């Protein structure tokens, strides 16, 4: 894809200068997909997860807005993907070929998310515009509002890296670990605290999203009942 | 009749935002409310009843499908037939649109019958 | 004959906290406990039986929806009919309410019949 | 009357891209649109009807398997029997192929009867 | 006759460690072996048969709940009726305990009938 | 009459690698190809038919259990009965073994009848 999208509550006037920063140094792909390295876990992932499907961002905004005690405003930033953006499917195939297992729970999870992972921090010149999502509480609608445009867009018009994430840690066997999800089967690494939400030392006081285990939910949708 | 018949309306790119289940008389039912979206596209409410309609044979196939469309949040296409449910209270609280079809959308176009 | 009569109570903003399944007098049953929104009130317990009362047709759909809402922990509205399951031990153990309906709740409004 | 006959055509390495559920006459039906994971060739559309054709017994095993493969996105093999459906609107909208078999396809070789 | 009856032994904080399915005579059966989370006691086995004993109505609900608990691996309370299966080879390879109930354990307290 | 009988063979530490569903003479069928871990060789193919053999009552229980075992990809034990299917075309296509039991293996000892 050419453009990814990320929902962040910080206003564009602070994101266009600070951008998105890496949480920690957990480069494991197995932890990132299930969210053990993201805000639902150690909170030290080396990848910033952004979706290319516009409906997924609406899903994140809806999940955070229709929650009754999340006090904040959400902004959908569109980001120009470059050679540091990787689709999780090419790397899942490679990791599964080197002596690892990705169950159908983690295979049906990327299919629902259209995740693209950035190995390094999203530089402020990679974000083109920020649309202020407006939540009409009386109607209960999430609609696009003032769509500000960043002036630092380089406009190289590049594309994502269609290869595999380099230097992937060796997969761990017999993980038997949970997959953190929120909202309408929105994976972890998509929540607000799934990135470095500490600018100038202070932290934005918003809700800690409760994540549920996606494996029973994926089994529920697969089995139909 | 058929889901793709002429007397069936369809709304594409809709996301099931609200799910409701219950029983009416002696038939189980489920209703789906789609996202308001934008413009003048007011949310579409479509209900299906297990043992009273004419779309009985497909009631289960919507039921498991709509649920997975509600859980996954996928943009889909809803085929509904208006003025099927006749109970005044049911039409006032829920809608009279019968859920008769569900299709997966892939941006561009949506799979399933048209026109 | 509907989860919308005056005899049906509903509790919104609830989250299914606990799930229990068993058999009671050759009737399979499932009970759901909602602990959220305790305050001064007690957690709400709703029990539905597979072959008892007038809510037999909607037992399966209610069971699937309760499981779906439990595995996701989503804020949901519970429609219950009080004063059923006249077994004294069953009441003192789990509840005397019948799970007649489940609806999705989204902060501002909740789907399904009201009042 | 088997998914191994000379009259059954199979396409391997397919991936179920789109799903559709509805009702035709008095029978529920589901259609799957699969695109080859190469980018070349027309998509394959396979439909199964609950109460029609000779493939009724396997309908319920193809509905939960295609939905299994649509959610997972695994590379699969689709066994269809062409020219089954006759209602001109149905073929012109969805397909005439009947979904009579589904298999898991691997990188080297893919499961199921061959030739 | 009831899961919470006096003849039923309940074991709390027991994660379902192993799952087995098969057929005994003309009845599909499933067995679950549960061990204590904090390495205590002896790991108990509970079996349910689809067409034997008086626990036939709850076989399906018990099977789906046992599968859910095995996928999530959550601390749950089992309700077993001792000395239900009589054939000797079944007792040597599996238990005589019948799986009659399942409930969820939420930290301190557990749902379901007690005592 | 039981998956623990002497006539029943079983293979431990198997992982379901391939899945196939279809129809055969008015009977829905599913076949699983399980491979030894670490790749010793000799894959085992086990098939179950909905309306053939003496294993109808446990067909569905083995279907939804195989699918789950295919979803998780865990080390499992397969209980099969050799020489059940008689159709030579079917035998050469998939197998003659009948899937009669499925068990969970914990890499220490597989839970189920042993011989």
Residue numbers in the entry:
A (entry chain B): 6 to 230
B (entry chain E), C (entry chain D), D (entry chain F), E (entry chain C), F (entry chain G): 1 to 115
What does the published report state?
In this study, we identified and characterized a typhoid toxin-like A2B5 toxin, designated diarizonae toxin (DiaT), as a key virulence factor in Salmonella diarizonae. The DiaT genomic islet encodes two distinct B subunits, PltBd1 and PltBd2, which exhibit unique functional roles. Through genetic and functional analyses, we demonstrate that the heteropentameric assembly of PltBd1 and PltBd2 is essential for cytotoxicity, with our data suggesting PltBd1 facilitates toxin secretion and PltBd2 mediates host cell targeting. The holotoxin consists of a pentameric B subunit arrangement supporting a single PltA subunit, with the amphipathic C-terminal tail of PltA extending into the central pore formed by the B subunits.
To validate the structural insights from the cryo-EM map of the endogenously expressed DiaT holotoxin, we recombinantly expressed PltBd1 homopentameric holotoxin, PltBd2 homopentameric holotoxin, and PltBd1/PltBd2 heteropentameric holotoxin in E. coli. Cryo-EM analysis resolved these structures at resolutions of 3.05 Å, 2.61 Å, and 2.94 Å, respectively. Pore radius measurements confirmed that the PltBd1 homopentamer exhibits the smallest pore radius with significant distortion, while the PltBd2 homopentamer displays a larger and straighter pore. Further analysis of PltA’s interactions with distinct B subunits identified a critical hydrophobic interaction between Ile227 of PltA and Ile71 of PltBd2. Additionally, Tyr70 in PltBd1 forms stable polar interactions with Asn230 in PltA, contributing to the narrow, contracted pore structure, a feature absents in the PltBd2 homopentamer. All holotoxins demonstrated cytotoxic activity, but the PltBd2 homopentamer exhibited the highest potency, approximately threefold greater than the PltBd1/PltBd2 heteropentameric toxin (DiaT) and nearly 75-fold greater than the PltBd1 homopentamer. Despite its potent intoxication potential, the PltBd2 homopentameric holotoxin failed to restore cytotoxicity in the pltBd1 and pltBd2 double deletion strain complemented with pltBd2 alone. This suggests that PltBd2 homopentamers are likely unable to mediate extracellular secretion. The lower average dissociation constant exhibited by PltBd2 suggests a higher affinity for these glycans than PltBd1. Conversely, PltBd2 features a valine residue at the corresponding position (triangle, 6E and S12), limiting its binding capacity for Neu5Gc-terminated glycans, akin to PltB in typhoid toxin.
